[PDB]
């Protein structure tokens, strides 16, 4: 089911980089001069929100056409800019003074760009993480030390720690995604060792991805996350503060509901759920968040579901090494989901005070 570019590498239409996976490779940092007013607001979001200046600065913008964003990277950068501006405009300082209408000079170009990219007109994982990063030194490896985000909402919102640790988890998982064609090849060729080493490589990369996930505690403070950053990742779908949604002035007449951030927007959980056949109203929210992933990445997840099952192949072999390599992959994925629930508990549930994991742990044998 996976379309191949050649005998080794999956098709470029999936937009999956060998080094950074679902992340956008070498994101664009600067827009054309034509868009300098957008870039100024987005780069000054912290001080503009703090000073109460953001909303009126947005209301003074002129209408800028999207016709000059001529390539994928420039359009993804513009989506990140307009997306951050939009979140900052709707929520403001996050105290309760919300805006239920997005001015047209942002809404129209934002919604037109989102239409081109087939993404909802709201900030999504693919914006604020997958495309929101740069290398400090191009000649040095992808490390926290050597990386930075492009945009933040409030000084001290820990957006670098939160977004970059997430990104580095995605990059660790990239080293596992590149092995997927080897898994299916080894199954058609009945190559025991090739499949075994592929599965152990995937397990090793997902375990490294968990070790990267651990870094979150060193760069994100629970209070700052729950009280500040979480605000700007919140949406207008089932939100009592925007019960009917947001009016995109000049694009739709009626308000429209779009969901805020969710860990389900990372294609990593589903990619290896499907590969390992450890797939689970929650299925309705899972599929919905799939439509918040980049379209090419949805198509990769779907092509994966059309390949033969690795679980079945492995358990029919009477092959302890293959079963233990498969189990190491599932265990790695279950541990990532456990840690996501631990982070939800420490960074949302506890500060608020003051089942996917089960389906996956069931499919171990
Ligand atoms: C817009 C937006 C903003 C951020 C995100 N983040 C996201 O999808 O992260 C994926 C994670 C889960 N988190 S998390 O810290 O548990 C985590 C916890 C909560 C959230 C929100 C605030 C959205 C509810 C987000 C993330 C870290 C990251 C690392 C590992 C585990 C998966 C991973 C890649 C496999 C999505 C939408």
Q: Which oligomeric form is depicted?
A: monomer
How many individual helices? 17
Cross-sheet strand order for the largest sheet = 1-4
CA distance, first residue to last residue: 26 Å
- Which structural class should the secondary elements be placed in? mainly alpha
Number of domains: 1
In sequence order, what are the helices and strands, one letter per element?
HHHHEHHEEHHHHHEHHHHHH
Which overall shape is indicated by the principal axes computed on the Cα atoms? globular
Strand share of the residues?
Answer: under 5%
PDB class: oxidoreductase
Keywords: IDO1, heme-binding protein, pseudo-natural product, oxidoreductase
Assembly: monomeric
Entry title: Crystal structure of human IDO1 in complex with iDeg-1
Helix and strand topology:
Layout: H1 36-43, H2 45-50, H3 54-60, H4 72-91, E1 101-102, H5 104-117, H6 125-128, E2 134-135, E3 147-148, H7 159-177, H8 180-189, H9 192-213, H10 216-219, H11 222-232, E4 247-248, H12 267-275, H13 282-290, H14 295-305, H15 310-315, H16 320-353, H17 356-362
Parallel strand pairs: 1-4
Antiparallel strand pairs: 2-3
The structure holds the ligand Cc1ccc(NC(=O)OC[C@]23CN(S(=O)(=O)c4ccc(C(C)(C)C)cc4)C[C@H]2C[C@H]2C[C@@H]3C2(C)C)cc1.
């Amino acid at each position: 089911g996976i379309q191949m570019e050649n005998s080794w590498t999956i098709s470029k239409e999936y937009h999956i980089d060998e080094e950074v996976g679902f992340a956008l490779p070498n994101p664009q940092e600067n827009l054309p001069d034509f868009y300098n007013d957008w870039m100024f607001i987005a780069k000054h979001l912290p001080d503009l929100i703090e000073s109460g200046q953001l909303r009126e600065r947005v209301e003074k913008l002129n209408m800028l056409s999207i016709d000059h964003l001529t390539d994928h990277k420039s359009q993804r950068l513009a989506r990140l800019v307009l997306g951050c501006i939009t979140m900052a405009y709707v929520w403001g300082k996050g105290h309760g003074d919300v805006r239920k209408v997005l001015p047209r000079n942002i809404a129209v170009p934002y919604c037109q760009l989102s239409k081109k990219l087939e993404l909802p007109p709201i900030l999504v994982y693919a914006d604020c993480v997958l495309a929101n990063w740069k290398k400090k030194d191009p000649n040095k490896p992808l490390t926290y030390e050597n990386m930075d985000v492009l945009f933040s909402f409030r000084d001290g919102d820990c957006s670098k720690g939160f977004f970059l640790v997430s990104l580095l988890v995605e990059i660790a998982a990239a080293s596992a995604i590149k092995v997927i064609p080897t898994v299916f090849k080894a199954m058609q060729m009945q190559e025991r060792d090739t499949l075994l080493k592929a599965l152990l490589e995937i397990a090793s990369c997902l375990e490294k991805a968990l070790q990267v996930f651990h870094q979150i505690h060193d760069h994100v403070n629970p209070k700052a996350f729950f009280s500040v950053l979480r605000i700007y990742l919140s949406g207008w779908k089932g939100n009592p503060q925007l019960s009917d949604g947001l009016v995109y002035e000049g694009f739709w007449e009626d308000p429209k509901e779009f969901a805020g951030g969710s860990a389900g927007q990372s294609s990593v959980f589903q990619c290896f759920d499907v590969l390992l056949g450890i797939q689970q109203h929650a299925a309705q929210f899972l599929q919905d968040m799939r439509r918040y992933m980049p379209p090419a990445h949805r198509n990769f997840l779907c092509s994966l579901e059309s390949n033969p099952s690795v679980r079945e192949f492995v358990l029919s072999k009477g092959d302890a090494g293959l079963r233990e390599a498969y189990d190491a992959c599932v265990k790695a994925l279950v541990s990532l989901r456990s840690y996501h629930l631990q982070i939800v508990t420490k960074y949302i549930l506890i500060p608020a005070s003051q089942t996917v994991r089960s389906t996956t742990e069931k499919s171990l044998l």
